[PDB]
Coordinates of all heavy atoms in Angstrom, one line a residue:
Chain A
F1 N -0.2 4.2 -15.6 CA -0.3 4.6 -17.0 C -1.7 4.4 -17.5 O -2.4 5.4 -17.8 CB 0.7 3.8 -17.8 CG 0.8 4.3 -19.2 CD1 1.5 5.5 -19.5 CD2 0.2 3.7 -20.2 CE1 1.6 6.0 -20.8 CE2 0.2 4.2 -21.6 CZ 1.0 5.3 -21.8
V2 N -2.1 3.2 -17.7 CA -3.5 2.9 -18.2 C -3.9 1.4 -18.0 O -5.0 1.1 -17.8 CB -3.6 3.3 -19.7 CG1 -2.7 2.4 -20.6 CG2 -5.1 3.2 -20.2
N3 N -2.9 0.5 -18.1 CA -3.3 -0.9 -17.9 C -2.0 -1.7 -17.6 O -2.0 -2.5 -16.7 CB -3.9 -1.5 -19.2 CG -2.9 -1.4 -20.4 OD1 -1.9 -2.0 -20.5 ND2 -3.2 -0.5 -21.3
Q4 N -0.9 -1.4 -18.2 CA 0.4 -2.1 -17.9 C 1.0 -1.5 -16.6 O 0.6 -0.4 -16.2 CB 1.4 -1.9 -19.0 CG 1.4 -3.1 -20.0 CD 2.1 -2.7 -21.3 OE1 2.9 -1.8 -21.3 NE2 1.8 -3.4 -22.3
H5 N 1.8 -2.2 -15.9 CA 2.4 -1.7 -14.7 C 3.6 -0.8 -15.0 O 3.9 -0.5 -16.1 CB 2.9 -2.9 -13.8 CG 1.7 -3.6 -13.2 ND1 0.9 -4.5 -13.9 CD2 1.1 -3.4 -12.0 CE1 -0.1 -4.9 -13.1 NE2 0.0 -4.2 -11.9
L6 N 4.3 -0.3 -14.0 CA 5.4 0.7 -14.2 C 6.6 0.2 -13.5 O 7.2 0.9 -12.7 CB 5.0 2.1 -13.7 CG 3.8 2.5 -14.5 CD1 3.1 3.7 -13.7 CD2 4.1 3.0 -15.9
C7 N 7.0 -1.0 -13.7 CA 8.3 -1.6 -13.0 C 9.1 -2.3 -14.0 O 8.6 -3.2 -14.7 CB 7.8 -2.5 -11.8 SG 8.6 -1.9 -10.3
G8 N 10.4 -2.0 -14.0 CA 11.3 -2.7 -15.0 C 11.4 -1.9 -16.2 O 11.5 -0.7 -16.2
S9 N 11.4 -2.5 -17.4 CA 11.4 -1.8 -18.7 C 10.0 -1.3 -19.1 O 9.9 -0.7 -20.1 CB 12.0 -2.6 -19.8 OG 11.0 -3.6 -20.2
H10 N 9.0 -1.5 -18.2 CA 7.7 -1.0 -18.6 C 7.5 0.5 -18.3 O 6.9 1.2 -19.0 CB 6.6 -1.8 -17.7 CG 6.7 -3.3 -18.0 ND1 6.4 -4.2 -17.0 CD2 7.1 -4.0 -19.1 CE1 6.6 -5.4 -17.5 NE2 7.0 -5.3 -18.8
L11 N 8.2 0.9 -17.3 CA 8.2 2.4 -17.0 C 8.8 3.2 -18.2 O 8.3 4.1 -18.7 CB 8.9 2.7 -15.7 CG 8.8 4.1 -15.2 CD1 9.7 5.0 -16.1 CD2 7.3 4.6 -15.3
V12 N 10.0 2.8 -18.5 CA 10.7 3.5 -19.7 C 9.9 3.5 -20.9 O 9.7 4.5 -21.6 CB 12.1 2.8 -20.0 CG1 12.9 3.6 -20.9 CG2 12.8 2.5 -18.7
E13 N 9.3 2.4 -21.3 CA 8.5 2.3 -22.5 C 7.3 3.2 -22.3 O 6.7 3.8 -23.3 CB 8.0 0.9 -22.7 CG 7.5 0.7 -24.2 CD 6.6 -0.6 -24.3 OE1 5.5 -0.5 -24.0 OE2 7.2 -1.6 -24.7
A14 N 6.8 3.4 -21.1 CA 5.7 4.3 -20.8 C 6.1 5.8 -21.1 O 5.3 6.6 -21.5 CB 5.2 4.1 -19.4
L15 N 7.3 6.1 -20.8 CA 7.8 7.5 -21.0 C 7.7 7.8 -22.5 O 7.3 8.9 -22.9 CB 9.2 7.7 -20.5 CG 9.3 7.1 -19.0 CD1 10.8 7.3 -18.6 CD2 8.4 7.8 -18.1
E16 N 8.1 6.9 -23.3 CA 8.1 7.1 -24.8 C 6.7 7.3 -25.2 O 6.4 8.1 -26.1 CB 8.7 5.9 -25.5 CG 9.4 6.3 -26.8 CD 9.4 5.2 -27.8 OE1 10.2 4.3 -27.7 OE2 8.5 5.2 -28.6
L17 N 5.8 6.5 -24.6 CA 4.3 6.7 -25.0 C 3.8 8.1 -24.6 O 2.9 8.6 -25.2 CB 3.5 5.6 -24.2 CG 2.5 4.9 -25.2 CD1 3.3 4.1 -26.3 CD2 1.7 3.9 -24.4
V18 N 4.4 8.7 -23.6 CA 4.0 10.0 -23.2 C 4.4 11.1 -24.2 O 3.7 11.7 -24.9 CB 4.6 10.3 -21.8 CG1 4.0 11.7 -21.3 CG2 4.2 9.2 -20.8
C19 N 5.7 11.3 -24.3 CA 6.3 12.3 -25.2 C 6.7 11.6 -26.5 O 6.0 11.6 -27.5 CB 7.5 13.0 -24.6 SG 6.9 14.5 -23.8
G20 N 7.8 10.9 -26.5 CA 8.3 10.2 -27.7 C 9.7 10.7 -28.2 O 10.3 10.1 -29.0
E21 N 10.1 11.9 -27.6 CA 11.4 12.4 -28.1 C 12.5 11.8 -27.2 O 12.3 11.6 -26.0 CB 11.4 13.9 -27.9 CG 10.8 14.6 -29.1 CD 10.7 16.1 -28.9 OE1 9.8 16.6 -28.3 OE2 11.6 16.8 -29.5
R22 N 13.7 11.6 -27.8 CA 14.8 11.0 -27.0 C 15.4 12.1 -26.1 O 15.3 13.3 -26.4 CB 15.9 10.5 -27.9 CG 15.3 9.3 -28.7 CD 16.2 9.0 -29.9 NE 17.1 7.9 -29.6 CZ 17.8 7.2 -30.5 NH1 17.7 7.6 -31.8 NH2 18.6 6.2 -30.2
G23 N 16.0 11.8 -25.0 CA 16.6 12.8 -24.1 C 15.5 13.7 -23.6 O 15.8 14.9 -23.2
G24 N 14.3 13.3 -23.6 CA 13.2 14.2 -23.1 C 12.6 13.7 -21.8 O 12.1 14.4 -21.0
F25 N 12.7 12.4 -21.5 CA 12.2 11.8 -20.3 C 13.3 10.9 -19.6 O 14.4 10.9 -20.1 CB 10.9 11.0 -20.5 CG 11.2 10.0 -21.6 CD1 11.8 8.8 -21.4 CD2 10.8 10.3 -23.0 CE1 12.1 7.9 -22.4 CE2 11.1 9.4 -24.0 CZ 11.7 8.2 -23.7
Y26 N 13.0 10.3 -18.6 CA 13.9 9.4 -17.9 C 14.4 8.3 -18.9 O 13.6 7.3 -19.2 CB 13.3 8.7 -16.6 CG 14.2 7.7 -16.0 CD1 15.6 7.9 -15.9 CD2 13.6 6.5 -15.5 CE1 16.4 6.9 -15.4 CE2 14.5 5.6 -14.9 CZ 15.9 5.8 -14.8 OH 16.7 4.8 -14.3
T27 N 15.6 8.3 -19.4 CA 16.1 7.3 -20.3 C 17.4 6.7 -19.7 O 18.4 7.1 -20.0 CB 16.4 7.9 -21.7 OG1 17.3 9.0 -21.5 CG2 15.1 8.5 -22.3
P28 N 17.2 5.6 -18.9 CA 18.4 4.9 -18.3 C 19.3 4.3 -19.4 O 19.1 3.1 -19.8 CB 17.8 3.8 -17.4 CG 16.2 3.9 -17.6 CD 15.9 5.0 -18.6
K29 N 20.2 5.1 -19.9 CA 21.1 4.5 -21.0 C 22.0 5.6 -21.5 O 23.2 5.4 -21.7 CB 20.3 4.0 -22.2 CG 19.2 5.0 -22.6 CD 19.2 5.1 -24.1 CE 18.7 3.8 -24.7 NZ 17.2 3.8 -24.7
Chain B
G1 N 6.9 11.0 -5.2 CA 7.4 9.8 -5.9 C 6.4 9.5 -7.1 O 5.2 9.8 -7.1
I2 N 7.0 9.0 -8.2 CA 6.1 8.7 -9.4 C 6.2 7.2 -9.8 O 5.2 6.5 -9.9 CB 6.6 9.5 -10.5 CG1 6.6 11.0 -10.1 CG2 5.6 9.4 -11.7 CD1 8.0 11.4 -9.7
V3 N 7.4 6.7 -9.9 CA 7.6 5.3 -10.2 C 7.3 4.4 -9.0 O 6.4 3.5 -9.1 CB 9.1 5.0 -10.7 CG1 9.2 3.6 -11.2 CG2 9.5 6.0 -11.8
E4 N 8.0 4.6 -7.9 CA 7.7 3.8 -6.7 C 6.2 4.0 -6.2 O 5.7 3.2 -5.5 CB 8.6 4.3 -5.6 CG 9.0 3.1 -4.7 CD 8.0 3.0 -3.5 OE1 7.7 4.1 -2.9 OE2 7.4 2.0 -3.3
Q5 N 5.6 5.1 -6.7 CA 4.2 5.3 -6.3 C 3.3 4.1 -6.7 O 2.4 3.7 -5.9 CB 3.6 6.6 -7.0 CG 2.6 7.3 -6.1 CD 3.4 8.5 -5.4 OE1 2.9 9.6 -5.5 NE2 4.4 8.2 -4.7
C6 N 3.5 3.6 -7.8 CA 2.7 2.4 -8.3 C 3.5 1.4 -9.1 O 3.1 0.9 -10.1 CB 1.5 2.9 -9.1 SG 0.0 2.9 -8.0
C7 N 4.7 1.2 -8.7 CA 5.6 0.3 -9.5 C 5.0 -1.1 -9.5 O 5.0 -1.8 -10.5 CB 7.0 0.2 -8.8 SG 8.3 0.0 -10.1
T8 N 4.5 -1.6 -8.3 CA 3.9 -2.9 -8.2 C 2.4 -2.8 -8.4 O 1.6 -3.6 -7.8 CB 4.3 -3.6 -6.9 OG1 5.6 -3.1 -6.5 CG2 4.2 -5.1 -7.0
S9 N 1.9 -1.8 -9.1 CA 0.4 -1.6 -9.2 C 0.2 -0.8 -10.5 O 1.1 -0.4 -11.2 CB -0.1 -1.0 -8.0 OG 0.8 -0.1 -7.5
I10 N -1.1 -0.4 -10.7 CA -1.4 0.5 -11.8 C -2.1 1.7 -11.3 O -3.3 1.7 -11.0 CB -2.3 -0.3 -12.8 CG1 -2.3 -1.8 -12.6 CG2 -1.9 0.0 -14.3 CD1 -3.3 -2.5 -13.5
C11 N -1.4 2.8 -11.2 CA -1.9 4.1 -10.7 C -2.6 4.9 -11.8 O -3.8 4.8 -12.0 CB -0.8 4.9 -10.0 SG -0.8 4.7 -8.2
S12 N -1.9 5.7 -12.5 CA -2.5 6.5 -13.6 C -1.4 7.2 -14.4 O -0.4 7.6 -13.9 CB -3.5 7.5 -13.0 OG -4.8 6.9 -12.9
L13 N -1.7 7.5 -15.7 CA -0.7 8.2 -16.5 C -0.5 9.6 -16.1 O 0.5 10.3 -16.3 CB -1.2 8.1 -18.0 CG -0.2 8.9 -19.0 CD1 -0.5 10.4 -18.9 CD2 1.3 8.7 -18.6
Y14 N -1.5 10.2 -15.4 CA -1.4 11.6 -14.9 C -0.1 11.8 -14.1 O 0.4 12.9 -14.0 CB -2.7 11.9 -14.1 CG -2.5 12.1 -12.6 CD1 -2.4 13.3 -12.0 CD2 -2.3 10.9 -11.8 CE1 -2.1 13.4 -10.6 CE2 -2.1 11.0 -10.4 CZ -2.0 12.3 -9.8 OH -1.8 12.4 -8.5
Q15 N 0.4 10.7 -13.5 CA 1.7 10.8 -12.7 C 2.9 10.9 -13.7 O 3.7 11.7 -13.5 CB 1.8 9.6 -11.8 CG 2.7 10.0 -10.6 CD 1.8 10.4 -9.4 OE1 0.6 10.6 -9.5 NE2 2.4 10.6 -8.2
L16 N 2.9 10.0 -14.6 CA 4.0 10.0 -15.6 C 4.0 11.2 -16.4 O 5.0 11.6 -17.1 CB 3.9 8.7 -16.5 CG 4.8 7.6 -15.9 CD1 4.5 6.3 -16.8 CD2 6.2 8.0 -16.0
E17 N 2.9 12.0 -16.4 CA 2.8 13.2 -17.3 C 3.9 14.2 -16.8 O 4.2 15.1 -17.6 CB 1.4 13.9 -17.1 CG 1.0 14.6 -18.3 CD 1.5 16.0 -18.3 OE1 1.1 16.8 -17.4 OE2 2.3 16.4 -19.2
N18 N 4.5 14.0 -15.6 CA 5.5 15.0 -15.2 C 6.9 14.4 -15.5 O 7.9 14.7 -14.8 CB 5.4 15.2 -13.7 CG 4.1 15.9 -13.3 OD1 3.1 15.8 -14.0 ND2 4.1 16.8 -12.4
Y19 N 7.0 13.6 -16.6 CA 8.3 13.1 -16.9 C 8.8 13.6 -18.3 O 9.6 13.0 -19.0 CB 8.2 11.5 -17.0 CG 8.6 10.9 -15.7 CD1 7.8 11.2 -14.5 CD2 9.7 10.1 -15.5 CE1 8.1 10.7 -13.3 CE2 10.0 9.6 -14.3 CZ 9.2 9.9 -13.2 OH 9.5 9.3 -11.9
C20 N 8.2 14.7 -18.8 CA 8.6 15.2 -20.1 C 9.3 16.5 -19.9 O 9.3 17.4 -20.7 CB 7.3 15.5 -20.9 SG 6.8 14.0 -21.8
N21 N 10.0 16.7 -18.8 CA 10.8 17.9 -18.5 C 12.0 18.0 -19.5 O 12.1 17.2 -20.4 CB 11.3 17.9 -17.1 CG 10.3 18.5 -16.2 OD1 9.3 17.9 -15.8 ND2 10.4 19.8 -15.8

């Protein structure tokens, strides 16, 4: 991404930083 | 692979850019 890693809930939070819309990226829930 | 590509490391946002489908 840019500095944080992408494992655990860090990857999901990174998807929101990319687009930001719900049901737009991988949303495990 | 995108997540497993650098899950235990820091690759680049250019990979996650393909997660807005």
Side-chain angles (χ1 to χ4, degrees):
Chain A
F1 188 76
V2 65
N3 58 73
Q4 261 165 24
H5 285 83
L6 301 164
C7 232
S9 74
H10 299 151
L11 186 284
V12 191
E13 198 196 84
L15 310 181
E16 211 209 278
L17 226 64
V18 184
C19 268
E21 275 177 279
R22 295 166 99 165
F25 52 83
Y26 174 39
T27 55
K29 48 138 64 86
Chain B
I2 307 98
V3 186
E4 212 268 312
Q5 213 97 125
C6 259
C7 216
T8 326
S9 35
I10 344 177
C11 262
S12 272
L13 177 279
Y14 108 102
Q15 204 97 352
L16 265 174
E17 212 270 297
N18 291 37
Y19 269 64
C20 274
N21 272 82

